[PDB]
Amino acid sequence: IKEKGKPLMLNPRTNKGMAFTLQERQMLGLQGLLPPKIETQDIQALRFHRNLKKMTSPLEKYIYIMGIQERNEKLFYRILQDDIESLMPIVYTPTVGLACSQYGHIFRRPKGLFISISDRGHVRSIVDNWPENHVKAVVVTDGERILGLGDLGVYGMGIPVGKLCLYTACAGIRPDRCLPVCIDVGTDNIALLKDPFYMGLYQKRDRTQQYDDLIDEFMKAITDRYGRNTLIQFEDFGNHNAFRFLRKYREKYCTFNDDIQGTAAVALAGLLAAQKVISKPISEHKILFLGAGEAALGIANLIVMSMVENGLSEQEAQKKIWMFDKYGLLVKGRKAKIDSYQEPFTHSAPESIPDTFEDAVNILKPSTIIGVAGAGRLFTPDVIRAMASINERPVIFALSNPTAQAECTAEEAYTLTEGRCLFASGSPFGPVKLTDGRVFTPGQGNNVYIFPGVALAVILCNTRHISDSVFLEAAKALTSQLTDEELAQGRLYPPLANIQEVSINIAIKVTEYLYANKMAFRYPEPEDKAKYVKERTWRSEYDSLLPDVYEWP
Amino acid sequence: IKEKGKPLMLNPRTNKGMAFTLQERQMLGLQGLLPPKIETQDIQALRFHRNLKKMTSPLEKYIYIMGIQERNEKLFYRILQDDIESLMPIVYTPTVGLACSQYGHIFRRPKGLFISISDRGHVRSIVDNWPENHVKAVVVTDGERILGLGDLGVYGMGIPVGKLCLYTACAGIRPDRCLPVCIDVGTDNIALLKDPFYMGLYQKRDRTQQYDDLIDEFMKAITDRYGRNTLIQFEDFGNHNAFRFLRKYREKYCTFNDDIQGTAAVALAGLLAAQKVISKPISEHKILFLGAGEAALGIANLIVMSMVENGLSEQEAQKKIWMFDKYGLLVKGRKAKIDSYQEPFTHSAPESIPDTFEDAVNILKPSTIIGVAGAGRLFTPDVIRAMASINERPVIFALSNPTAQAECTAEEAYTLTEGRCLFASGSPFGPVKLTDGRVFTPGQGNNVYIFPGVALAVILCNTRHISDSVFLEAAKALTSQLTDEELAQGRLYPPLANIQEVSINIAIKVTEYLYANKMAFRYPEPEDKAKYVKERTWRSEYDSLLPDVYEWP
Amino acid sequence: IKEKGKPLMLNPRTNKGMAFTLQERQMLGLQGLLPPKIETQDIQALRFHRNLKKMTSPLEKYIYIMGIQERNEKLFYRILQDDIESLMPIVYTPTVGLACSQYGHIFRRPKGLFISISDRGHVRSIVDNWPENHVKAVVVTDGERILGLGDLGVYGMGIPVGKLCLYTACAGIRPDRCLPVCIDVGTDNIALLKDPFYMGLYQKRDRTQQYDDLIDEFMKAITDRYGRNTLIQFEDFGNHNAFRFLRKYREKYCTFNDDIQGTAAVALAGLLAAQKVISKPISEHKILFLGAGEAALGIANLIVMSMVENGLSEQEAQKKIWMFDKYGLLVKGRKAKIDSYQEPFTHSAPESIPDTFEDAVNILKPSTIIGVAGAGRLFTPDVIRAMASINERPVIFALSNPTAQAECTAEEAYTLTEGRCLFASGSPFGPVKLTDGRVFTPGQGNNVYIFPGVALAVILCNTRHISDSVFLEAAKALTSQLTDEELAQGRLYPPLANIQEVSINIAIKVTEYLYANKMAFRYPEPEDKAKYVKERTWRSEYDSLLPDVYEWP
Numbered sequence A, B, C: 001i002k003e004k005g006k007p008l009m010l011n012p013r014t015n016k017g018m019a020f021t022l023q024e025r026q027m028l029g030l031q032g033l034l035p036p037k038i039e040t041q042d043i044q045a046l047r048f049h050r051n052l053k054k055m056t057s058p059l060e061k062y063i064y065i066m067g068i069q070e071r072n073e074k075l076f077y078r079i080l081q082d083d084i085e086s087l088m089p090i091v092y093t094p095t096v097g098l099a100c101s102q103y104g105h106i107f108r109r110p111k112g113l114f115i116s117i118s119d120r121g122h123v124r125s126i127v128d129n130w131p132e133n134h135v136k137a138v139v140v141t142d143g144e145r146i147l148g149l150g151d152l153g154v155y156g157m158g159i160p161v162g163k164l165c166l167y168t169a170c171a172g173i174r175p176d177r178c179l180p181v182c183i184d185v186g187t188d189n190i191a192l193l194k195d196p197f198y199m200g201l202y203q204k205r206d207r208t209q210q211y212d213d214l215i216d217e218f219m220k221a222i223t224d225r226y227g228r229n230t231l232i233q234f235e236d237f238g239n240h241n242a243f244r245f246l247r248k249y250r251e252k253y254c255t256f257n258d259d260i261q262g263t264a265a266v267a268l269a270g271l272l273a274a275q276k277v278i279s280k281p282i283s284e285h286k287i288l289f290l291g292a293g294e295a296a297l298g299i300a301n302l303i304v305m306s307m308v309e310n311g312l313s314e315q316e317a318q319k320k321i322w323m324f325d326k327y328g329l330l331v332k333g334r335k336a337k338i339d340s341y342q343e344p345f346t347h348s349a350p351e352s353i354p355d356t357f358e359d360a361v362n363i364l365k366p367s368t369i370i371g372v373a374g375a376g377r378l379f380t381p382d383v384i385r386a387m388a389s390i391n392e393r394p395v396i397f398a399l400s401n402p403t404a405q406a407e408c409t410a411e412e413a414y415t416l417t418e419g420r421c422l423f424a425s426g427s428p429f430g431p432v433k434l435t436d437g438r439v440f441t442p443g444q445g446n447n448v449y450i451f452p453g454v455a456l457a458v459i460l461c462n463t464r465h466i467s468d469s470v471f472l473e474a475a476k477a478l479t480s481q482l483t484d485e486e487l488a489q490g491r492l493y494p495p496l497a498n499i500q501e502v503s504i505n506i507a508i509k510v511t512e513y514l515y516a517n518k519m520a521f522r523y524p525e526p527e528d529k530a531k532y533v534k535e536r537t538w539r540s541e542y543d544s545l546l547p548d549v550y551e552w553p
């Protein structure tokens, strides 16, 4: 660090608070600007937990902790690391959805880069305004599909911000090499347009070619300054655009879409663990999705990749997967439109045309059910009872977020199937004890289990493009960490409390895969992949800021 | 403004948030670093009040609002300005006392300059570490007598910080020209010495000549760098040190003691207003003080100054004044020691020596009672009832702070006297409505009504030293702004809500006084002192940060 | 750029002087700090040539122009560009040698990174002290063999400094991406160890393993901060270390030795041009070197690569080469030592052992002669007359530098052979007109014709390592640019006034070779190489420093 004096305290990246040693204070011009007390990160950590403990609401907790990131970055991450599982619901789903829908009312300081349609032709000048010179990862959103909350416009910047926090909290990626970005081309949200606190352009969404050009101009600007292999993760974009930009840029830049490919990998991993207990014959699998968008089509695709690799031909696999959206069951010749992606899973209408999702379950008699409609409690008791009636061990996945949009609760799933189901959810739920004394502990099927470790692998390997088989590998790498004991408790995923090592482990496996398939370019190739990864993780412990002073012989 | 980029946003002195213009953004390198929305201070203020309204406790509010000062200085004062009366109890007494006691728990960022006994011989280098180069006003403490809370050590820094906020919020003094200072020579407070969050040196107070030498080195360092006429206000020092440092510096430097002299001025003004209703024959006045320290002795010396200038002799005036401390009534020959400042009011004991304060009232039969012991409710119902019985219109001042250390309440005072008392308090109390329907609105006899306006004047006139007559004058300037309809409500002081103009008016009147007596060195002399003063007040309105761009012919 | 105000003028990299436009001055805070006149670089250029014209000595001119590098970088390179051929003798050989030998007397400001043996163990902290963060090229020396001047210790920093100027002035490599380094481990120069103005450690050279560590620590420090593919050009190292370091590092880092490999290619090119006029049968080629060091072994080796390529075998080619050093003809069994590298060119003594270089010429009767002993006029008249007798068109290369160390002059070569010799020198010599009227314009055989264009190629291709065959291609790309007309005048190389385009053209040839041989890693690969290189060259034209201000819809 080149700076000295107060500027060191004003920048959260460097500010150590009372943890600045006396030598540091005297040598860096800080003597007098801090109380005469020298503290440790541990004392600071104590102050935090003491304070947090006394707090009452989750949003209040969110504002308190997210604020530390703007005062003392090192301490911020230390605090998450102290107990990531307990803070996850505040910092991530579901409280993050609340913060977003409230972004303008709680505003204090901005975070990330903001690029609006009004800046077209001048995006490179905006990118050059970013203080950090070595960004490696970017998470960008246009805010049209924020969780299951829909179009929140610029209030959606909360997502990319929180997403990168996990980059560092889960996989040890350097915070100063991360860049959250929000593309503001307007919002179709009538209430936000009438909101005095709204933080974006007061106009409807510009869907013309101008939009595509702005995005294209954005990708170019980012890579022109930071490099062609700068990781770019697309997050919470609308259905149409999400698929379009993925197909358009995946072979050109180092990019992927979390909602489509990250979700694909976590779901598969949970489906794999489930099979470990059911061991059902492949010719018998029959999956039915509620919803048919980004997540649904992404999961369905990884599932087919797996079945195919487990025998079945691509076409046979697809026949095992069905979808039911807001218009009904996806069957050939239906009135409602069917896109190019849904096509493969759109099949000939069965004996009868289901009117409700309950009808579908009964007619189709699926073995697995996957909720990803973002429309609330659609896995009703009747649907849950039907699944348990049809199956001995039904697999029930309600992945919509935040919690309020989920398809059903863990308690609803376990109690209604007499503890026979294998359940997973997108948002957090605690253990379930039935009137009979049995206790079931459900796992969280959320892409946070996937993106952190995959991002670290790609960054470290100087990888240029991310293929789908890279997520298939991550799926396998995550599920191979589940122990029988945990599986026994009802967990289809490793404990959230250990998400740090689980990520690092996924990174190691993925970098082993990239190098093995000639997708890595970092040289020379490391002998010991695991030691290589573990060796380059960012730590929340303070570094010495003292200059190298030494005597000459 | 020689800075551009993120730094403009990291420094609260310059940060405007979404209030930075689009042109300011494009020209200063901030485009992209802020959300697309351009806001007005008016909207920012709206976000604050909405948020504050949702909050429950005062210390939570105190943390919220004092934090704004570290994010956006201008909005901070705008927030205070929007309603100084409702925020004073949170930002000032009592809550400021609660915050000092909680200082180590609520810590987030330091404020002010910290000089410790361990830094002796290096004070200058610490002073040179302060970022601003044109400081004009300093408020310093050692934390030995924080309000009526006692020795709070470094936790007492919240006092100078708070006093200086009022320098700007009440008198329009420029924030960047203000500097809070805490002298840390240790603490005798056992509780803090075993507190892991304590912010100072872990040692008992050093009271050797090394203490004196540090104060010496402090005064010299401050004036060597900022100028000999720099205003230095002492605050909350222990009794012995407060008096000796005043005597020691008042003619060498531009310094005064707020607790001694400031309190004297506010007390006298309330007494001057009371007399407006009592019209009591000077010879009959009999004043009894509960306590005989810094505040008590200062008020007493000014009372005498008023009396002497109204006809009495110095000796004849000091005889109308009696003091009762923790050892009892001050009389000639008593065992408890009597200092040089106390002699003038230590009289030959009466017929019977009072054992309790109630006895001293019934024996001396005072017309006025002034509580300044900081020991709690020593003005008991019996004491209040005695005054109501002795005087038709008793004068009762409970000036001890915070509220818990106050001798009595407004409710108690008016009620027990049947609305016959003229009551004032150091801390805030709402209006009292007697069961007969009458309502009383008590004034706040606190030095906040005096130090801001006196400081402004002194600074503007480049005054070199402060005489007691300045305070006598300032006492006159305050009361002169009290209206009948106000006195009628029961207020012995102008409504807190207009503390801004009151302070400006007092300032104008003191600068006139300083010039008239040749104590002002600002040249040339303003013909219109009012215009002169009002002209130089700092405003909370945002300033334009745009570079001067213009076409040449 | 993120700075504004005086810093902009203090930093030579940005300073434009009166070239700062009015709008630039107003928006960036320079209004008033510059005279009211707005100038053009053309006017500034005129001012320079005007003042240089009145100057007397070459050193006085060197001091003046090198100083501009520290005041206005953009202008410094415009000045060279105006007329490189006339400035080269001042900025390069021979005046650079006089500068170095005088480095301590002419000092005003330092240039480059200095690393001493006394900083062993702390080199990384030194590297981190360099202001630029994207270095792509380094040129380093320890000053043991500065030109033919010998060991000049730290006074040799002029060499690396001058080389990098040419990197920019010749091939358009960005100046901020270049970094000259001097390794000071002491000096054996007894004179310098007695010079109160000497700029390095006052101790003889440390030749222990410590020397090896330092260099190792240096290579690691550099690569860690800037990357594994950062170009590191070695220059003017002693004989032993030059070869040992080259071998040791050529496979681990992207490095080469200018004196060994650079010189190899220039000389080969000149030889190739001569062959055009001589058409001598490859079978009768007979080269005799005067000197057996870095350059001699470097040229001989590239020479062989060609013959071998043109039919012969490595064995028979080497037999055509002979060498003669300060001890005599390199013959097997000789008293004096013959190292690993000399081996292939140390042959079985001839019937008669040559006592002097003339006798050597007489006995071996070579077709070509190449001086690279750096010990003065060893190509005596008799030796030149001999070559003329033995040969119809003798080839005479006197490459030792600086001019005073050259083997003979152009006038000596042409006159003594009656215009039949094909001559080239390392230092500059003007045209020669014989008594009979014929005018001969000699070419300069210096690596400056090679290192700039190769460096640019490597850097642009993200090349990891440099093969000797790369220098064979450079030798061809250079000679391939020669026109029969220039050859007609007597030039064996393109005119110096064209070095810029001759460099870019060589750079374009090499990146095609690199890519073609899978040695390039930049991605994707450029379709049109010429366009790719020309598009990436740095220009000395001022760039606009105005912020991006624009209207929003």
Ligand SMILES: NC(=O)c1ccc[n+]([C@@H]2O[C@H](COP(=O)([O-])OP(=O)(O)OC[C@H]3O[C@@H](n4cnc5c(N)ncnc54)[C@H](O)[C@@H]3O)[C@@H](O)[C@H]2O)c1
Pocket (backbone or CB within 6 Å): A134, A136, A172, A173, A174, A177, A459, A460, A461, A462, A522, A536, A537, A538, C133, C224, C225, C226, C227, C228
């Ligand atoms: N202060 C700086 O700007 C700075 C400091 C250190 C390294 N670097 C850069 O790193 C490269 C050197 O390689 P290396 O030793 O870092 O490792 P490496 O070469 O083994 O790592 C490969 C890539 O992963 C990146 N990387 C490593 N750890 C990372 C982390 N924890 N979070 C995010 N990105 C990470 C690196 O930047 C590098 O591009 C150099 O090119 C240099 O530019 C820059």
Ligand SMILES: NC(=O)c1ccc[n+]([C@@H]2O[C@H](COP(=O)([O-])OP(=O)(O)OC[C@H]3O[C@@H](n4cnc5c(N)ncnc54)[C@H](O)[C@@H]3O)[C@@H](O)[C@H]2O)c1
Pocket (backbone or CB within 6 Å): A145, A146, A147, A148, A149, A238, A239, A258, A259, A260, A263, A266, A290, A291, A292, A293, A294, A295, A296, A324, A325, A326, A327, A371, A372, A373, A374, A375, A378, A399, A400, A401, A402, A405, A425, A426, A427, A445, A446, A447, A448
């Ligand atoms: N747990 C995870 O890791 C994770 C990851 C990504 C997305 N999600 C969640 O999945 C949900 C959908 O995300 P997406 O990107 O696929 O959305 P999308 O907008 O691309 O698709 C939404 C789909 O839901 C369908 N739908 C809406 N209402 C329906 C209803 N009432 N009944 C039946 N179908 C209905 C739509 O027709 C559409 O097919 C969101 O709530 C999101 O939070 C979870």
Ligand SMILES: NC(=O)c1ccc[n+]([C@@H]2O[C@H](COP(=O)([O-])OP(=O)(O)OC[C@H]3O[C@@H](n4cnc5c(N)ncnc54)[C@H](O)[C@@H]3O)[C@@H](O)[C@H]2O)c1
Pocket (backbone or CB within 6 Å): B145, B146, B147, B148, B149, B238, B239, B258, B259, B260, B263, B266, B290, B291, B292, B293, B294, B295, B296, B324, B325, B326, B327, B372, B373, B374, B375, B378, B399, B400, B401, B402, B405, B425, B426, B427, B445, B446, B447, B448
């Ligand atoms: N309202 C204002 O503007 C204002 C200004 C300054 C100080 N004060 C308040 O006045 C109080 C005293 O401050 P100070 O500077 O005078 O302190 P000090 O220590 O100088 O004097 C305190 C005096 O009160 C006496 N005392 C203590 N306990 C007593 C008891 N139980 N009964 C009778 N007398 C007792 C002490 O003996 C001493 O003489 C503090 O609580 C402070 O907050 C108010």
Ligand SMILES: NC(=O)c1ccc[n+]([C@@H]2O[C@H](COP(=O)([O-])OP(=O)(O)OC[C@H]3O[C@@H](n4cnc5c(N)ncnc54)[C@H](O)[C@@H]3O)[C@@H](O)[C@H]2O)c1
Pocket (backbone or CB within 6 Å): B134, B136, B172, B173, B174, B177, B459, B460, B461, B462, B522, B536, B537, B538
């Ligand atoms: N950026 C700076 O450092 C800066 C800027 C403007 C003025 N100044 C100083 O002000 C002096 C010129 O006089 P002037 O035109 O400012 O006023 P002035 O001469 O009318 O005022 C007399 C004194 O009061 C002070 N002052 C005025 N308003 C003040 C305020 N609102 N809060 C605190 N202090 C205040 C001034 O510093 C000055 O020393 C010069 O000595 C100069 O050094 C400094």
Ligand SMILES: NC(=O)c1ccc[n+]([C@@H]2O[C@H](COP(=O)([O-])OP(=O)(O)OC[C@H]3O[C@@H](n4cnc5c(N)ncnc54)[C@H](O)[C@@H]3O)[C@@H](O)[C@H]2O)c1
Pocket (backbone or CB within 6 Å): A133, A223, A224, A225, A226, A227, A228, C134, C136, C172, C173, C174, C177, C459, C460, C461, C462, C522, C536, C537, C538
């Ligand atoms: N201000 C900066 O630090 C800055 C500015 C622009 C680009 N860059 C870097 O350049 C890379 C992007 O590629 P590009 O668009 O520059 O070109 P490129 O990728 O086509 O060029 C290939 C390599 O040659 C280097 N290069 C190009 N011209 C050079 C020159 N004239 N002199 C010396 N080296 C030169 C580049 O640094 C690059 O590493 C990124 O890695 C980025 O970090 C840095």
Ligand SMILES: NC(=O)c1ccc[n+]([C@@H]2O[C@H](COP(=O)([O-])OP(=O)(O)OC[C@H]3O[C@@H](n4cnc5c(N)ncnc54)[C@H](O)[C@@H]3O)[C@@H](O)[C@H]2O)c1
Pocket (backbone or CB within 6 Å): C145, C146, C147, C148, C149, C238, C239, C258, C259, C260, C263, C266, C290, C291, C292, C293, C294, C295, C296, C324, C325, C326, C327, C372, C373, C374, C375, C378, C399, C400, C401, C402, C405, C425, C426, C427, C445, C446, C447, C448
């Ligand atoms: N023109 C160019 O492009 C260019 C490039 C590199 C080096 N050079 C010049 O070549 C000269 C030597 O450099 P080097 O790297 O080969 O050095 P070196 O020390 O590695 O080799 C010098 C050789 O000359 C021999 N020698 C010394 N004195 C001799 C004498 N009196 N008679 C006969 N032989 C003698 C030595 O034995 C040795 O073999 C220097 O003057 C240098 O300036 C020119």
Ligand SMILES: O=C([O-])C(=O)[O-]
Pocket (backbone or CB within 6 Å): A093, A146, A147, A148, A236, A258, A259, A400, A401, A446, A447
């Ligand atoms: O989109 C989502 O809901 C997510 O990523 O968790």
Ligand SMILES: O=C([O-])C(=O)[O-]
Pocket (backbone or CB within 6 Å): B093, B146, B147, B148, B236, B258, B259, B400, B401, B446, B447
């Ligand atoms: O000391 C006090 O109580 C004050 O200053 O208000």
Ligand SMILES: O=C([O-])C(=O)[O-]
Pocket (backbone or CB within 6 Å): C093, C146, C147, C148, C236, C258, C259, C400, C401, C426, C446, C447
């Ligand atoms: O070493 C030399 O003489 C050179 O490079 O010109």
Ligand SMILES: [Mn+2]
Pocket (backbone or CB within 6 Å): A147, A235, A236, A258, A259
């Ligand atoms: Mn998402």
Ligand SMILES: [Mn+2]
Pocket (backbone or CB within 6 Å): B147, B235, B236, B258, B259
């Ligand atoms: Mn006080």
Ligand SMILES: [Mn+2]
Pocket (backbone or CB within 6 Å): C147, C235, C236, C258, C259
């Ligand atoms: Mn050289």
